Homo-oligomer: A and B are copies of this chain.
């Protein structure tokens, strides 16, 4: 097919969302008392999801700045 900016961006945002969801489910099960999951697993995955969130936010800010700079030049 083609690079599919819309489809690619959608897939990336889905990756962010499902990493957050996996971290949240793990923390849910840990605080509910379900055996297995270790504490360091919970903290490490939560921080990984937070870093993914921050990377997405920074990408968004840069792209929004680019779009608003391009759509302001007088033609």
> Which chain A residues have a beta carbon within 8 Å of chain B's beta carbons?
39, 43, 46, 50, 53-55, 57-62, 64-66, 68-70, 72-75
Contact = CB atoms under 8 A, between A and B. Distances in A.
Given A46-B62, A50-B65, A66-B50, A57 B73 contact: yes
Nearest to A61: B73
A70 B71 CA distance: 12
A70 B50 contact: no
A75 B65 contact: no
Nearest to A42: B55
A54 B69 contact: yes
Given A54-B69, A61-B74, A64-B73, 11 more contacts: A46-B58, A50-B62, A50-B65, A57-B69, A57-B70, A57-B72, A60-B73, A61-B72, A61-B73, A65-B74, A68-B74
